[PDB]
Amino acid sequence: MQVWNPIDNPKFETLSYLPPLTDNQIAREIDYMLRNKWIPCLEFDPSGTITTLPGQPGYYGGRYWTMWKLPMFGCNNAGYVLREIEHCKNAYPGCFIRVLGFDNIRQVQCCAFIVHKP
Amino acid sequence: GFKAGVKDYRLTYYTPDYETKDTDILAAFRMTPQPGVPPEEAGAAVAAESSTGTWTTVWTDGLTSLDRYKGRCYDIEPVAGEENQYIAYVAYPLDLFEEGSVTNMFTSIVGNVFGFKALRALRLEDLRIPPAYSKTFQGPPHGIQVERDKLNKYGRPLLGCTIKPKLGLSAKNYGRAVYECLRGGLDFTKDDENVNSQPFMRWRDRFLFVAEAIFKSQAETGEIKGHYLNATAGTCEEMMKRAQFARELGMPIVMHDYLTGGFTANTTLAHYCRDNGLLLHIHRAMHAVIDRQRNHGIHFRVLAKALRMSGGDHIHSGTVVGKLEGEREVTLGFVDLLRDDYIEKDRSRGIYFTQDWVSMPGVLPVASGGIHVWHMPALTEIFGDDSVLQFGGGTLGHPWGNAPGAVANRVALEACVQARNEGRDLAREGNDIIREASKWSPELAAACEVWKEIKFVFETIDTL
Amino acid sequence: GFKAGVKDYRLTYYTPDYETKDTDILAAFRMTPQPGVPPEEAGAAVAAESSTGTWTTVWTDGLTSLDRYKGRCYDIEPVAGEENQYIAYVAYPLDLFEEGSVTNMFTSIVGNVFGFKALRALRLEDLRIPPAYSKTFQGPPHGIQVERDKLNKYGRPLLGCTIKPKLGLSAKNYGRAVYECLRGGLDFTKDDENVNSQPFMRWRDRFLFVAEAIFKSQAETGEIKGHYLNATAGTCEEMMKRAQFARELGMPIVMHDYLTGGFTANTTLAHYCRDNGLLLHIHRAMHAVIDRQRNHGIHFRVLAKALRMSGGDHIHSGTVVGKLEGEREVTLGFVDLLRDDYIEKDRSRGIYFTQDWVSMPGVLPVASGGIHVWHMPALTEIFGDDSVLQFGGGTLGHPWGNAPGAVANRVALEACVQARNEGRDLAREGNDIIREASKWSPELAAACEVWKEIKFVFETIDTL
Amino acid sequence: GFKAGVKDYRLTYYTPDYETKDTDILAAFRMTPQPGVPPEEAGAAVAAESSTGTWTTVWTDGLTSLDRYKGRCYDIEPVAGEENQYIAYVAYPLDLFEEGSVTNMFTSIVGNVFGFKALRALRLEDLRIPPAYSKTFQGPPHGIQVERDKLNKYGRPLLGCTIKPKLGLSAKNYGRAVYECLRGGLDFTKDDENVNSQPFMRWRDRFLFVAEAIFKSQAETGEIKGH
Amino acid sequence: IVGNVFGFKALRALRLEDLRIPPAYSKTFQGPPHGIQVERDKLNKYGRPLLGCTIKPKLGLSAKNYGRAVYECLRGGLDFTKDDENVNSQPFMRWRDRFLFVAEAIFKSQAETGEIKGH
Ligand SMILES: O=C(O)[C@@](O)(COP(=O)(O)O)[C@H](O)[C@H](O)COP(=O)(O)O
Ligand SMILES: O=C(O)[C@@](O)(COP(=O)(O)O)[C@H](O)[C@H](O)COP(=O)(O)O
Ligand SMILES: [Mg+2]
Ligand SMILES: [Mg+2]
Ligand SMILES: [Mg+2]
Ligand SMILES: [Mg+2]
């Protein structure tokens, strides 16, 4: 038998139970997004912690992050999206970075995963 | 004038040249007449005892207009492969129903016509609700998008589990198995249908112990967790006392059974969850007594179009591959009436009419019952990205415990959502995606051996 | 040890030499196994999947005593005339049920076992309730003895009528037709099942006119009269608002439906009626969807016992010579379970177990469904002196009006009651008693001619 | 792209080939354009500033579909006998309104478009309420038939009167003049618009004095009376 | 003052211009709840006029996107942020969750610049 380690083992949601992500695996998750006509975006924030309230159901803190420049309306190649992750990690090298994707017909998000850790 | 006597039904209730309006309700029956009765006398009798009329003539009918309050039959077609079965169509006006009540609609359609002495069988198949009638209801409290926004979860189907054995555990030991399962990587966990309040465990001693474990398990991984709390009772006062304690503790979701509690207590709870900001999970019990047989009862696609108008966020739907009966082409057909916004007629999937919901929120289907890891790349391909998957016996039966058993159901799931967005087929190659992932995770190879040839295959009863 | 794996059910859930206790609940099933399954493995799964058990083994079962909380099958016998049908018996402990709730029992017994892939049919027949469990319920509000004392009526059965057409009348015409019927000699008057509130007539307007019409006819003949008011709504706070007004106007009786409104909403109404001194009348709707077929569903004698514990005063039992199905030996069998206090086993009438009610009041059966004057000397011999007789279409169809139509019905009953306690036979004779009373009453000879050869004779489906 | 700037209204809000649905609300306006403005520009500007619109372009419009939330002008015709007056038609989608509220409906149509600098006049004429929207309201309490049935009066119109010293009467004198009018043969009697509560006559005793006379005037002729 | 006189058959126009309220009649009313000085004392703002903004497009946004655009505007230097005249409750967005999403953003935007903000 074996024991799961309960000390200092945080997780970060989707695709966080697999071996660490490498290049040519990030570029293939953006091609699948563009051929379904969705809009990419970027975000960053120093600390990923959450809080609560005494007696209010459905309320939590720490769900909003900062937007890099603006959503990219009209992107058609996976080069301009892979060249904007380097400018962000050279100006704020001590923060997290996460990638999104929007849909306007149903007004919901479709993807989210981390690409950098401090 | 007024003449006392007995006449036929066909002279008044059979008009096969009638054009339907846009504010009418339509229904379809599949009947079997009794020897010695014409097929056109049974269809008229079915429609002439659900709206107005009786077995003899009365004198009080001259004070009103009866050409704007009757039900009519306007089509008959025989079935293929039999000799004593037909299909009939009926139309009802709009001024016959009460706004905002579902228990009234059923009472006026399936009230008494099911026990006549001139028939041997009857079954209801479909219905058509006009848009002028759906606007008087409230609908689901939150819907689909508002539920995903609150929990901050996108990309993959959710996961859950239920606690076994069904009955016999204490109150402190019951809150200890929840923490182990929740710290492993699961999103939800669930009580059971028949656990309300019993001498071995009371209802106020379980809430506290569950709440204590949820907070402890939430601050260790850094994700939002939840738990369904059962709220069924035997009185409408005891039911509203158990839903006010969860609001005080700050819990996000509750549970109810809508077929044994009734169609009246469900609307009251749905009207309160909306005003206090909670989520509702619906369990379908005692549903096989009306369904299953193909020559008597009511289809499930009709029982599912009333829950949307009544109120609810989750609904059970069953699994095609499991220990309970189900069929693929019918499930794929009646799963589209729960999520979409405009469906079209299709007789290859059971749909008879055309339905639109004029911007009403949808519901999330749920699949559960007798499944394990080897069934994973067959459930992602059918349902899609909006479902809930529940493993009850596949988690607590792991040879190593509870926490190691939950790390095996998440790796086996995140490896299928990654091989799909690369251009690989999930049907032909399904035993090769859960054979390469079991080479870097020691907790999945230890589980791919206990259950390896356990399959359920049997004959089907309800053949389309 | 633990030894995770999959085993059979018969190894733990088949005890063919067990002695029942005095605090147990027993049930009888009738099943049709799927080809390729031993009979003993079929009856051992129903018990397992109803109290405790799943498809695999779990490690949490070692913390409790399992053979104190499990159900078991202790007898299997084959049916005569078939080759794939048997009867099974199951026993349940007492600590598995919540006190005072009927929903829990139905959720625990008929929850999920009805849709297994290894079976093709199933039907429940009977139950036995120990006296230690029925003492936690309240029971009927008033009963039989108190109602007769309050209404001051002894000697003969009661009478009633219902208004037709079902839908279409206004608020004032509906009220003016009650007075004519009441002044003729009847006792009660009934609304209709599908009449709650509609654009052509609202409830508060109809209540006032009915109340005004009741008073006028009471002071002219000098007898107590009443009328049933429907109190079915679509939400709970609307149902409890229509009873307070009826109490305020001083009306003595109300009405409800207990199969479409649900079990939870019925107990609250029963409690309110007990605490405010009203009377309750129960209408059975949507009951042929579960009954009728003899190889799937639930019998009515089981559905009748739950109503007694839940609460009520009147209940519909159906007729034998009407337009709806029914049999004599079964009706006579299950009337006793409603009226009596100690019933013994009898397989010629459908009873399997012995039942005693330890001094709980009974209920009054009701007969209806398409009878006329010629059927009177055959209905007084079956039921007896404790019943209610209703004529819906046989009163408003008389060739002379409403008031003359009630005298004909009233005279035909007091002539049969008088001829019984003199030594005459009501079965061989009965076409001669009426022809002699129709010689001094001109309002009965006019009715003995319109309906003279009207009968309903067909085959039977549920042959015992 | 985004391309921040200022553009016209006609390029987006003038579609004169549109087929109306059966769940839409329609309206008719009459307008007098300001010298130097084409009629179509004003017709399009009226619709834009009512549902979704402003004087410039914003970047938050790419996150939603704007072809299911806009109002359209689909017809313009000129009046006869003038030279600077026209009639316009507008259509609105169903899901822009709140069920069961009248205050919300008036706020979205006559809210702000009545004070533009490019117009000199405007008047609303008619509306078309679909049957799918009027079913969410309650309507009149009783109606007509339920009102005639309660009072037991058939055949002829009704009658009434109002006491007409508008202000200045006491309470007892006010109650006295009702009896002499009800005993004459009338059916109803009315207060006045500007009479609620004033230092010469409060309400709680006027009610009592009227109620006392109503009962007396009823038992002498044998008919139902009211006030 | 104006109930019926505006529709007489002997006139073709009418307009009201001004009124005079005696001091003996205005003392029976309550008046504004707070006023000017009390409002300024609570927010701790002196010297300059105030600033604000409103969200566009008027109708069509969801509940989370509505709350996202408020934080960005508030963290820039503004003081207030307004809803809209015809936004009460509609199928695309209800009120009980819009309130929560706005409240979550206000607290986050307030603790980063150290100034009082409202909406
Ligand atoms: O009670 C049970 O058996 C379950 O908790 C499954 O447990 P296991 O997974 O451990 O077997 C579910 O209620 C059934 O799936 C009911 O079926 P459904 O609601 O789909 O009809
Ligand atoms: O039409 C009806 O529905 C009745 O009013 C009978 O009216 P008529 O006597 O005028 O035919 C009763 O409800 C039926 O007897 C119900 O059957 P049951 O209670 O036996 O299930
Ligand atoms: Mg279960
Ligand atoms: Mg009836
Ligand atoms: Mg006036
Ligand atoms: Mg504005």
Instruction: Return the structure tokens found at C427.
Output: 């079965």
Cβ of B317 below 6 Å from ligand 1: no
Say which ligand is closest to the CA of C365: 2
d(CA C101, CA C136): 9
d(CA A15, CA A24): 16
DSSP string, C26-46: EEEEEEEEPTT--HHHHHHHH
DSSP string, A52-117: --SS-TT--B----EE-S---TT--SSSTTTSHHHHHHHH-TTSEEEEEEEETTTTEE---EEEE-
Question: Cβ of C90: how many Cβ atoms within 10 Å?
Answer: 22
C-alpha distance from residue B96 to each of B23, B66, B93, C169, C228 (Å): 12, 13, 6, 12, 21
The verdict on E97 touching B (C-beta cutoff 8 Å) is yes
Between the CA of C393 and the centroid of ligand 2 the distance, in Å, is 10
d(CA C260, CA C310): 15
d(CA B39, CA B88): 10
DSSP H or E segment with residue C440 = none
> What is the length of chain C?
464
End-to-end CA distance of chain D: 69
Mode of pairing for the β-strands spanning C364-367 and C314-316: parallel
As for chain A, the residues directly before each break of C–N over 2.5 Å are none
Residue B132 contacts residue B23 (beta carbons within 8 Å): yes
Report helix, strand or coil for C88: strand
Q: With an 8 Å Cβ cutoff, are A58 and B221 in contact?
A: no
Single-letter amino acid code for the residue at E117: K
Say which ligand is closest to the CA of C371: 2
Q: B135 to chain E nearest CA, in Å?
A: 11
C-alpha distance from residue E33 to each of C274, E21, E38, E81 (Å): 53, 20, 10, 22
Instruction: Return the structure tokens found at B240.
Output: 């509203």
Could you identify the residue written with the tokens 């309470």? D171
Which chain C residues contact residue D146 at CB under 8 A?
A: 171, 205
Kindly state the DSSP code that residue A24 receives in the 8-state scheme.
T
Cβ of B185 below 6 Å from ligand 1: no
Partner residue opposite E68 with nearest CB, options A56, A61, A64: A64
Mode of pairing for the β-strands spanning A96-103 and A108-109: antiparallel
Phi and psi at residue E76, to the nearest 5°? -85, -30
Kindly state the DSSP code that residue B394 receives in the 8-state scheme.
H
Give the residue ranges of DSSP H helices in B89-201.
Answer: 103-107, 131-134, 145-151, 176-182
Upstream peptide bond of E57 is cis (omega within 30 degrees of 0): yes
Chain C: list its partners (3+ Cβ pairs within 8 Å): B, D
The verdict on D16 touching A (C-beta cutoff 8 Å) is no
Residue B41 contacts residue B9 (beta carbons within 8 Å): yes
Q: D134 to chain C nearest CA, in Å?
A: 14
CA dihedral (B62, B66, B69, B73) positive or negative: positive
- Among B159, B162, B181, B228, name the best residue to mutate to test ligand 1's pocket (greatest count of ligand atoms within 8 A of Cβ): B162
Please enumerate in sequence order all residues whose Cβ is within 8 A of that of C451, keeping only pairs 6 or more positions apart, or say none: B6, B56, C372, C373, C374, C394
Give the closest residue to A64 by CA, choosing from E109, B224, B154: E109
Kindly state the DSSP code that residue C161 receives in the 8-state scheme.
E
Do chain C and chain B touch with ≥3 beta carbon pairs under 8 Å?
Answer: yes
Residue C458 contacts residue B117 (beta carbons within 8 Å): yes
Between the CA of C97 and the centroid of ligand 3 the distance, in Å, is 17
Q: With an 8 Å Cβ cutoff, are D65 and A70 in contact?
A: no
The verdict on D151 touching C (C-beta cutoff 8 Å) is no
Please enumerate in sequence order all residues whose Cβ is within 8 A of that of D8, keeping only pairs 6 or more positions apart, or say none: D41, D44
Cβ of B365 below 6 Å from ligand 1: no
The verdict on C67 touching B (C-beta cutoff 8 Å) is no
Could you identify the residue written with the tokens 């006793």? C336
The verdict on D106 touching A (C-beta cutoff 8 Å) is no
Chain B: list its partners (3+ Cβ pairs within 8 Å): A, C, D, E
| Residue in B with minimal Cα distance to A53 | B250
Which chain B residues contact residue C47 at CB under 8 A?
A: none
Q: With an 8 Å Cβ cutoff, are D64 and E69 in contact?
A: no
Please enumerate in sequence order all residues whose Cβ is within 8 A of that of C427, keeping only pairs 6 or more positions apart, or say none: C378, C381
d(CA C40, CA E42): 81
Which chain B residues contact residue E92 at CB under 8 A?
A: 359
Return the residue whose CA atom lies nearest to atom 18 of ligand 1: B318
Single-letter amino acid code for the residue at C351: I
d(CA B406, CA B396): 9
Report helix, strand or coil for C97: coil
- The DSSP bridge partners found for residue B123 are B297
What is the side-by-side strand order in the sheet with B229-230? B158-161, B388-391, B364-367, B314-316, B279-283, B253-257, B229-230
Question: Cβ of A19: how many Cβ atoms within 10 Å?
Answer: 8
d(CA B228, CA B213): 14
Partner residue opposite D136 with nearest CB, options B23, B131, B136: B136
Give the closest residue to B225 by CA, choosing from C258, E75, A11, A3: A11
Give the closest residue to A108 by CA, choosing from B42, C311, B144: B144
Cβ of B324 below 6 Å from ligand 1: yes
The verdict on C234 touching B (C-beta cutoff 8 Å) is yes
| Residue in B with minimal Cα distance to A47 | B222
Report helix, strand or coil for B198: strand
Single-letter amino acid code for the residue at B456: F
Give the closest residue to B102 by CA, choosing from B131, B69, B129, B71: B129
Instruction: Return the structure tokens found at B15.
Output: 């008009």
Between the CA of D192 and the centroid of ligand 5 the distance, in Å, is 5
Q: With an 8 Å Cβ cutoff, are A50 and B407 in contact?
A: no
Which chain B residues contact residue C450 at CB under 8 A?
A: 4-5
Q: With an 8 Å Cβ cutoff, are A102 and D59 in contact?
A: no
d(CA C343, CA B89): 47
C-alpha distance from residue A43 to each of B223, C85, C398 (Å): 19, 67, 84
d(CA D125, CA D31): 11
Q: Which residues of B are catalytic?
A: 164, 283
Q: D96 to chain B nearest CA, in Å?
A: 12
Give the closest residue to B358 by CA, choosing from B139, B106, B103: B139
C-alpha distance from residue D215 to each of C317, C343, D171, D211, D219 (Å): 52, 64, 17, 7, 7
d(CA B177, CA C63): 12
Q: Which residues of C are catalytic?
A: 164, 283
CA dihedral (E91, E97, E102, E104) positive or negative: negative
Between the CA of C193 and the centroid of ligand 4 the distance, in Å, is 6
Mutant choice from B154, B186, B420, B436 vs A, greatest count of A C-beta within 10 A: B154
What angle, rounded to 10 degrees, do the helices at C300-310 and C264-276 form? Answer: 40
Partner residue opposite A64 with nearest CB, options E62, E100, E105: E105
- How far is CA D161 from its chain centroid? 28
DSSP H or E segment with residue A51 = none
d(CA B209, CA B201): 12
As for chain D, the residues directly before each break of C–N over 2.5 Å are none
Residue C33 contacts residue C118 (beta carbons within 8 Å): yes
